[PDB]
């Protein structure tokens, strides 16, 4: 992997592994999501930021501030087959005082064709109190030199899927998968549940017949609260329609929302 | 990755990823186990075998026979750090009519030093009836040309740990993690639970304080029966012991049917 010529984006190639593919012998969306995090981490390292999933600058560490994902949006046109090489390009944009955005483009290394695209919204938080914050001028002015100054969007189209508001699933859910809990492999180096685990949990309540006859095309996921290591989650899904679904992850006991999202599936 | 000069073994380098490491910022044993399966798959593909976790010959496919793991034994001296490159060499050996063995050696790419080793026992089974069988002469004679003829062992030592008999944990277990179930990410391309998931489930019943103060050095795991996609597993652990040793048992949550048994050895950090 390497920073591009202008130093404002990063590229890395990955050979899809035998254990990374599903029943169609192509990479799962969780494998894709893990590769997006890996290339994001390598980009942060290359330009001098923290490497731990929080991409902090010097002033942020002094203030005990971290970056946390508010939303992940992924659209896949073709999942790479086992043994294939996929090239991923990533960059960050400053969105004023709201926060930052990290975008990605996926291409087939042999054809050069765009096979997928992703975008994510990140907000600043105190790591101890968990209190959200607007980005200050002194903090923002420090990282602006690592971003393209003009807008560069993986999802440019006006009123596109990536920015749509997601409603809250109403009980009773059409489908459910209850009592999901993280194991040590679901945790990151800081003992926090990996963001990709929540995508897997959302997908658990999709019926196996949809998975067997359809390909996932778009997933949009909002992150409201963390699942702790000793928490238990219920995954709820209701058809809203191509097949479209509305999703809700909540804590198994009190029903506290942790995530909400939508998926769009194309018949094979 | 590539076959070595003599065509009897295969080597591949891997750069450790950010999501592959634990609290020590080094690769977890499940990341290591996944890399061992990946290099085994690439070796099978390079010499013309099936690529699906069953490494079948044309004759085996005709007879609906597959290879299935009976035991996995891994010993790690140093876990590779995040960003480090690890080189893994793998080869297979025919063990007469009993079955086959796949061995691996792990090295730090920069120093060339052996950082770990692993060995696994594989038995032949009918895919449909799940009935085990000895290896036939016509099947064995077909794959012997892909193995070194003289013994080449990752664990040569006399009565070494890799071949030791594992006893059955007696109730009550000292520690337990109940109601473990696989999700789609735990499944392979054939919708079977990945062998590495069982290592993760075994480790779930080790107390967090042991994980925080010790490094896993050796794990030996026997595979008795598959966990199906809709099965639920209980993970049991009892201390048997500077070094801590444990006895492990995975069984189906309802009837208590054994799926795996194993042992782990941990050294204080
Ligand atoms: O790799 C990057 C690029 C831009 C960027 C901007 C802010 C930040 O905190 C981390 C960042 O990492
Ligand atoms: O890669 C290999 C090497 C030897 C070998 C021997 C038997 C077999 O079924 C698969 C095999 O794959």
mmCIF file of C-alpha atoms in Angstrom, chain A:
data_model
loop_
_atom_site.group_PDB
_atom_site.id
_atom_site.type_symbol
_atom_site.label_atom_id
_atom_site.label_comp_id
_atom_site.label_asym_id
_atom_site.label_seq_id
_atom_site.Cartn_x
_atom_site.Cartn_y
_atom_site.Cartn_z
ATOM 1 C CA UNK A 1 0.000 0.000 0.000
ATOM 2 C CA UNK A 2 0.990 3.627 -0.573
ATOM 3 C CA UNK A 3 -0.095 7.270 -0.541
ATOM 4 C CA UNK A 4 -0.849 8.520 -4.101
ATOM 5 C CA UNK A 5 1.389 11.148 -5.854
ATOM 6 C CA UNK A 6 -0.389 14.184 -4.304
ATOM 7 C CA UNK A 7 -0.380 12.597 -0.786
ATOM 8 C CA UNK A 8 -4.162 13.187 -0.390
ATOM 9 C CA UNK A 9 -5.356 9.546 -0.759
ATOM 10 C CA UNK A 10 -4.086 5.987 -0.144
ATOM 11 C CA UNK A 11 -4.244 2.769 -2.240
ATOM 12 C CA UNK A 12 -3.792 -0.887 -1.257
ATOM 13 C CA UNK A 13 -4.270 -4.248 -3.054
ATOM 14 C CA UNK A 14 -5.694 -7.381 -1.340
ATOM 15 C CA UNK A 15 -5.841 -10.997 -2.597
ATOM 16 C CA UNK A 16 -9.194 -12.514 -1.476
ATOM 17 C CA UNK A 17 -8.619 -15.473 0.959
ATOM 18 C CA UNK A 18 -10.308 -18.917 1.111
ATOM 19 C CA UNK A 19 -11.923 -18.197 4.544
ATOM 20 C CA UNK A 20 -13.093 -14.688 3.437
ATOM 21 C CA UNK A 21 -15.693 -15.960 0.894
ATOM 22 C CA UNK A 22 -19.342 -17.103 1.219
ATOM 23 C CA UNK A 23 -21.456 -19.733 -0.663
ATOM 24 C CA UNK A 24 -21.002 -17.908 -4.010
ATOM 25 C CA UNK A 25 -17.126 -18.176 -3.629
ATOM 26 C CA UNK A 26 -16.928 -14.337 -3.543
ATOM 27 C CA UNK A 27 -15.914 -12.046 -0.628
ATOM 28 C CA UNK A 28 -18.643 -11.492 2.017
ATOM 29 C CA UNK A 29 -19.717 -7.879 2.817
ATOM 30 C CA UNK A 30 -18.002 -8.339 6.268
ATOM 31 C CA UNK A 31 -14.707 -9.220 4.507
ATOM 32 C CA UNK A 32 -15.156 -6.023 2.371
ATOM 33 C CA UNK A 33 -15.925 -3.934 5.545
ATOM 34 C CA UNK A 34 -12.764 -5.365 7.299
ATOM 35 C CA UNK A 35 -10.632 -4.453 4.182
ATOM 36 C CA UNK A 36 -12.110 -0.873 4.263
ATOM 37 C CA UNK A 37 -10.997 -0.553 7.939
ATOM 38 C CA UNK A 38 -7.537 -1.989 7.165
ATOM 39 C CA UNK A 39 -6.887 0.478 4.284
ATOM 40 C CA UNK A 40 -8.206 3.353 6.495
ATOM 41 C CA UNK A 41 -5.770 2.342 9.240
ATOM 42 C CA UNK A 42 -2.808 2.123 6.798
ATOM 43 C CA UNK A 43 -3.714 5.592 5.405
ATOM 44 C CA UNK A 44 -3.777 7.092 8.986
ATOM 45 C CA UNK A 45 -0.385 5.481 9.760
ATOM 46 C CA UNK A 46 1.201 6.786 6.544
ATOM 47 C CA UNK A 47 0.449 10.436 7.391
ATOM 48 C CA UNK A 48 1.287 10.327 11.142
ATOM 49 C CA UNK A 49 -2.024 9.635 12.930
ATOM 50 C CA UNK A 50 -2.958 7.216 15.742
ATOM 51 C CA UNK A 51 -3.336 3.583 14.830
ATOM 52 C CA UNK A 52 -6.097 2.046 17.041
ATOM 53 C CA UNK A 53 -9.347 2.847 15.135
ATOM 54 C CA UNK A 54 -9.564 6.396 16.611
ATOM 55 C CA UNK A 55 -7.104 8.276 14.181
ATOM 56 C CA UNK A 56 -6.204 10.946 16.748
ATOM 57 C CA UNK A 57 -3.919 13.937 16.365
ATOM 58 C CA UNK A 58 -1.572 15.245 19.123
ATOM 59 C CA UNK A 59 -4.126 17.758 20.500
ATOM 60 C CA UNK A 60 -6.917 15.126 20.516
ATOM 61 C CA UNK A 61 -4.856 12.768 22.734
ATOM 62 C CA UNK A 62 -4.218 15.626 25.235
ATOM 63 C CA UNK A 63 -7.998 16.365 25.351
ATOM 64 C CA UNK A 64 -8.894 12.598 25.508
ATOM 65 C CA UNK A 65 -10.862 12.946 22.223
ATOM 66 C CA UNK A 66 -11.451 10.125 19.704
ATOM 67 C CA UNK A 67 -13.204 9.678 16.317
ATOM 68 C CA UNK A 68 -16.169 7.320 16.356
ATOM 69 C CA UNK A 69 -18.341 6.067 13.440
ATOM 70 C CA UNK A 70 -21.863 7.487 13.232
ATOM 71 C CA UNK A 71 -22.729 5.869 9.841
ATOM 72 C CA UNK A 72 -21.333 3.345 7.342
ATOM 73 C CA UNK A 73 -22.822 3.114 3.769
ATOM 74 C CA UNK A 74 -21.557 0.458 1.295
ATOM 75 C CA UNK A 75 -22.644 -0.318 -2.291
ATOM 76 C CA UNK A 76 -21.187 -3.372 -4.091
ATOM 77 C CA UNK A 77 -21.684 -3.965 -7.872
ATOM 78 C CA UNK A 78 -19.516 -7.151 -7.939
ATOM 79 C CA UNK A 79 -17.996 -9.062 -4.978
ATOM 80 C CA UNK A 80 -14.393 -10.153 -5.745
ATOM 81 C CA UNK A 81 -13.941 -13.887 -6.279
ATOM 82 C CA UNK A 82 -11.567 -16.012 -4.120
ATOM 83 C CA UNK A 83 -7.992 -15.510 -5.434
ATOM 84 C CA UNK A 84 -8.876 -12.189 -7.108
ATOM 85 C CA UNK A 85 -6.945 -8.996 -6.366
ATOM 86 C CA UNK A 86 -9.059 -5.992 -5.355
ATOM 87 C CA UNK A 87 -7.610 -2.422 -5.244
ATOM 88 C CA UNK A 88 -9.078 0.001 -2.703
ATOM 89 C CA UNK A 89 -8.493 3.795 -2.711
ATOM 90 C CA UNK A 90 -9.430 5.830 0.400
ATOM 91 C CA UNK A 91 -9.377 9.493 1.433
ATOM 92 C CA UNK A 92 -10.837 11.725 4.178
ATOM 93 C CA UNK A 93 -12.788 14.962 3.965
ATOM 94 C CA UNK A 94 -13.289 17.572 6.659
ATOM 95 C CA UNK A 95 -17.020 18.480 6.965
ATOM 96 C CA UNK A 96 -16.626 21.714 8.945
ATOM 97 C CA UNK A 97 -17.619 21.472 12.611
ATOM 98 C CA UNK A 98 -19.921 18.423 12.068
ATOM 99 C CA UNK A 99 -17.043 15.947 11.792
ATOM 100 C CA UNK A 100 -15.128 14.071 9.094
ATOM 101 C CA UNK A 101 -15.980 11.621 6.321
ATOM 102 C CA UNK A 102 -13.852 8.720 4.992
ATOM 103 C CA UNK A 103 -14.688 7.514 1.466
ATOM 104 C CA UNK A 104 -13.492 4.448 -0.486
ATOM 105 C CA UNK A 105 -13.571 3.181 -4.071
ATOM 106 C CA UNK A 106 -13.069 -0.536 -4.864
ATOM 107 C CA UNK A 107 -11.789 -1.721 -8.266
ATOM 108 C CA UNK A 108 -10.989 -5.038 -9.932
ATOM 109 C CA UNK A 109 -7.175 -4.906 -10.278
ATOM 110 C CA UNK A 110 -7.203 -6.700 -13.664
ATOM 111 C CA UNK A 111 -9.996 -4.705 -15.403
ATOM 112 C CA UNK A 112 -9.652 -1.356 -13.557
ATOM 113 C CA UNK A 113 -13.488 -1.302 -13.315
ATOM 114 C CA UNK A 114 -15.191 0.137 -10.191
ATOM 115 C CA UNK A 115 -16.756 -2.830 -8.368
ATOM 116 C CA UNK A 116 -17.906 -0.981 -5.211
ATOM 117 C CA UNK A 117 -17.924 2.272 -3.221
ATOM 118 C CA UNK A 118 -18.318 3.240 0.434
ATOM 119 C CA UNK A 119 -18.676 6.290 2.634
ATOM 120 C CA UNK A 120 -18.606 6.779 6.412
ATOM 121 C CA UNK A 121 -19.429 9.672 8.836
ATOM 122 C CA UNK A 122 -17.272 10.145 11.934
ATOM 123 C CA UNK A 123 -17.958 12.352 14.992
ATOM 124 C CA UNK A 124 -15.655 13.507 17.834
ATOM 125 C CA UNK A 125 -16.239 12.138 21.340
ATOM 126 C CA UNK A 126 -14.573 12.345 24.770
ATOM 127 C CA UNK A 127 -13.384 8.695 25.267
ATOM 128 C CA UNK A 128 -14.068 8.750 29.036
ATOM 129 C CA UNK A 129 -17.442 10.605 29.330
ATOM 130 C CA UNK A 130 -18.693 9.440 25.849
ATOM 131 C CA UNK A 131 -19.949 13.025 25.268
ATOM 132 C CA UNK A 132 -20.177 14.049 21.606
ATOM 133 C CA UNK A 133 -18.618 17.290 20.451
ATOM 134 C CA UNK A 134 -18.415 19.684 17.534
ATOM 135 C CA UNK A 135 -14.916 19.882 15.995
ATOM 136 C CA UNK A 136 -12.918 22.863 17.309
ATOM 137 C CA UNK A 137 -10.977 25.223 14.983
ATOM 138 C CA UNK A 138 -7.551 24.351 16.542
ATOM 139 C CA UNK A 139 -8.197 20.579 16.079
ATOM 140 C CA UNK A 140 -9.711 20.887 12.549
ATOM 141 C CA UNK A 141 -7.017 23.256 11.227
ATOM 142 C CA UNK A 142 -4.385 20.615 12.218
ATOM 143 C CA UNK A 143 -5.761 17.811 9.970
ATOM 144 C CA UNK A 144 -7.000 19.853 6.979
ATOM 145 C CA UNK A 145 -3.575 19.439 5.198
ATOM 146 C CA UNK A 146 -4.172 15.649 4.913
ATOM 147 C CA UNK A 147 -7.555 16.052 3.053
ATOM 148 C CA UNK A 148 -8.407 17.238 -0.489
ATOM 149 C CA UNK A 149 -9.636 20.854 -0.121
ATOM 150 C CA UNK A 150 -12.264 20.672 -2.909
ATOM 151 C CA UNK A 151 -15.085 18.085 -2.421
ATOM 152 C CA UNK A 152 -14.257 14.555 -3.625
ATOM 153 C CA UNK A 153 -17.225 12.250 -3.105
ATOM 154 C CA UNK A 154 -17.611 8.524 -3.580
ATOM 155 C CA UNK A 155 -21.408 9.249 -3.739
ATOM 156 C CA UNK A 156 -21.789 12.544 -5.601
ATOM 157 C CA UNK A 157 -25.452 12.228 -6.885
ATOM 158 C CA UNK A 158 -27.866 14.710 -5.207
ATOM 159 C CA UNK A 159 -30.332 13.091 -2.713
ATOM 160 C CA UNK A 160 -28.473 9.736 -2.941
ATOM 161 C CA UNK A 161 -29.033 6.682 -0.625
ATOM 162 C CA UNK A 162 -25.981 7.393 1.656
ATOM 163 C CA UNK A 163 -27.576 10.448 3.325
ATOM 164 C CA UNK A 164 -31.196 9.176 3.692
ATOM 165 C CA UNK A 165 -32.822 9.248 7.180
ATOM 166 C CA UNK A 166 -33.509 5.751 8.654
ATOM 167 C CA UNK A 167 -36.770 5.187 10.601
ATOM 168 C CA UNK A 168 -37.113 3.063 13.778
ATOM 169 C CA UNK A 169 -38.475 -0.488 13.241
ATOM 170 C CA UNK A 170 -41.873 -0.889 15.023
ATOM 171 C CA UNK A 171 -42.703 -4.097 17.022
ATOM 172 C CA UNK A 172 -43.543 -6.802 16.032
ATOM 173 C CA UNK A 173 -40.529 -7.378 13.715
ATOM 174 C CA UNK A 174 -41.188 -9.691 10.704
ATOM 175 C CA UNK A 175 -37.938 -11.636 11.433
ATOM 176 C CA UNK A 176 -35.552 -11.860 14.435
ATOM 177 C CA UNK A 177 -32.311 -13.477 15.636
ATOM 178 C CA UNK A 178 -32.117 -13.217 19.469
ATOM 179 C CA UNK A 179 -29.321 -13.595 22.031
ATOM 180 C CA UNK A 180 -26.347 -12.651 19.859
ATOM 181 C CA UNK A 181 -23.166 -12.048 21.867
ATOM 182 C CA UNK A 182 -19.598 -11.100 20.940
ATOM 183 C CA UNK A 183 -16.684 -13.503 21.412
ATOM 184 C CA UNK A 184 -12.963 -12.455 21.775
ATOM 185 C CA UNK A 185 -12.478 -12.617 17.958
ATOM 186 C CA UNK A 186 -15.175 -9.872 17.597
ATOM 187 C CA UNK A 187 -13.089 -7.451 19.748
ATOM 188 C CA UNK A 188 -10.395 -5.009 18.517
ATOM 189 C CA UNK A 189 -6.950 -4.276 20.114
ATOM 190 C CA UNK A 190 -8.675 -1.915 22.664
ATOM 191 C CA UNK A 191 -11.223 -4.670 23.734
ATOM 192 C CA UNK A 192 -14.088 -2.795 21.995
ATOM 193 C CA UNK A 193 -16.543 -4.683 19.669
ATOM 194 C CA UNK A 194 -15.263 -4.271 16.062
ATOM 195 C CA UNK A 195 -17.609 -2.097 13.883
ATOM 196 C CA UNK A 196 -17.893 -4.943 11.329
ATOM 197 C CA UNK A 197 -19.455 -7.308 13.948
ATOM 198 C CA UNK A 198 -22.594 -5.053 13.997
ATOM 199 C CA UNK A 199 -22.964 -5.514 10.167
ATOM 200 C CA UNK A 200 -22.856 -9.318 10.723
ATOM 201 C CA UNK A 201 -25.451 -9.095 13.519
ATOM 202 C CA UNK A 202 -27.786 -6.934 11.328
ATOM 203 C CA UNK A 203 -27.541 -9.583 8.567
ATOM 204 C CA UNK A 204 -28.278 -12.511 10.954
ATOM 205 C CA UNK A 205 -32.037 -11.749 10.942
ATOM 206 C CA UNK A 206 -32.298 -11.835 7.082
ATOM 207 C CA UNK A 207 -33.917 -15.207 6.162
ATOM 208 C CA UNK A 208 -31.537 -17.784 4.636
ATOM 209 C CA UNK A 209 -33.805 -17.995 1.489
ATOM 210 C CA UNK A 210 -33.116 -14.304 0.676
ATOM 211 C CA UNK A 211 -29.361 -14.905 1.145
ATOM 212 C CA UNK A 212 -29.542 -18.028 -1.111
ATOM 213 C CA UNK A 213 -31.428 -16.235 -4.000
ATOM 214 C CA UNK A 214 -30.248 -12.611 -3.750
ATOM 215 C CA UNK A 215 -27.026 -10.620 -3.628
ATOM 216 C CA UNK A 216 -26.673 -7.727 -1.147
ATOM 217 C CA UNK A 217 -26.318 -4.498 -3.138
ATOM 218 C CA UNK A 218 -26.487 -1.649 -0.583
ATOM 219 C CA UNK A 219 -26.266 -1.533 3.240
ATOM 220 C CA UNK A 220 -26.593 1.688 5.308
ATOM 221 C CA UNK A 221 -26.017 1.434 9.038
ATOM 222 C CA UNK A 222 -26.320 4.072 11.806
ATOM 223 C CA UNK A 223 -24.325 3.503 15.062
ATOM 224 C CA UNK A 224 -26.085 4.930 18.175
ATOM 225 C CA UNK A 225 -24.367 3.198 21.104
ATOM 226 C CA UNK A 226 -21.717 0.531 21.659
ATOM 227 C CA UNK A 227 -22.407 -3.113 22.491
ATOM 228 C CA UNK A 228 -20.138 -3.878 25.502
ATOM 229 C CA UNK A 229 -18.188 -7.174 25.808
ATOM 230 C CA UNK A 230 -20.786 -8.593 28.261
ATOM 231 C CA UNK A 231 -23.917 -7.257 26.441
ATOM 232 C CA UNK A 232 -26.444 -9.472 24.499
ATOM 233 C CA UNK A 233 -28.106 -8.213 21.293
ATOM 234 C CA UNK A 234 -31.354 -8.971 19.412
ATOM 235 C CA UNK A 235 -31.382 -8.383 15.660
ATOM 236 C CA UNK A 236 -34.744 -7.384 14.110
ATOM 237 C CA UNK A 237 -35.700 -7.151 10.389
ATOM 238 C CA UNK A 238 -38.927 -6.218 8.492
ATOM 239 C CA UNK A 239 -39.416 -6.207 4.692
ATOM 240 C CA UNK A 240 -40.227 -2.716 3.363
ATOM 241 C CA UNK A 241 -40.554 -3.576 -0.374
ATOM 242 C CA UNK A 242 -35.420 -5.946 -5.606
ATOM 243 C CA UNK A 243 -35.993 -6.678 -1.888
ATOM 244 C CA UNK A 244 -35.510 -3.945 0.768
ATOM 245 C CA UNK A 245 -35.390 -4.372 4.549
ATOM 246 C CA UNK A 246 -35.463 -2.145 7.674
ATOM 247 C CA UNK A 247 -33.180 -3.270 10.550
ATOM 248 C CA UNK A 248 -32.831 -2.667 14.282
ATOM 249 C CA UNK A 249 -30.216 -4.005 16.802
ATOM 250 C CA UNK A 250 -31.141 -3.527 20.442
ATOM 251 C CA UNK A 251 -29.885 -4.831 23.806
ATOM 252 C CA UNK A 252 -31.694 -8.141 24.677
ATOM 253 C CA UNK A 253 -32.912 -7.049 28.081
ATOM 254 C CA UNK A 254 -34.114 -3.446 28.226
ATOM 255 C CA UNK A 255 -34.434 -2.974 24.436
ATOM 256 C CA UNK A 256 -31.918 -0.065 24.279
ATOM 257 C CA UNK A 257 -31.155 0.715 20.580
ATOM 258 C CA UNK A 258 -27.552 0.182 19.477
ATOM 259 C CA UNK A 259 -27.952 0.413 15.627
ATOM 260 C CA UNK A 260 -30.544 0.883 12.899
ATOM 261 C CA UNK A 261 -30.150 0.319 9.151
ATOM 262 C CA UNK A 262 -31.463 -0.623 5.716
ATOM 263 C CA UNK A 263 -30.376 -3.217 3.103
ATOM 264 C CA UNK A 264 -31.218 -3.532 -0.629
ATOM 265 C CA UNK A 265 -30.916 -6.947 -2.340
ATOM 266 C CA UNK A 266 -30.889 -7.838 -6.097
ATOM 267 C CA UNK A 267 -32.279 -11.252 -7.277
ATOM 268 C CA UNK A 268 -29.393 -13.453 -8.599
#
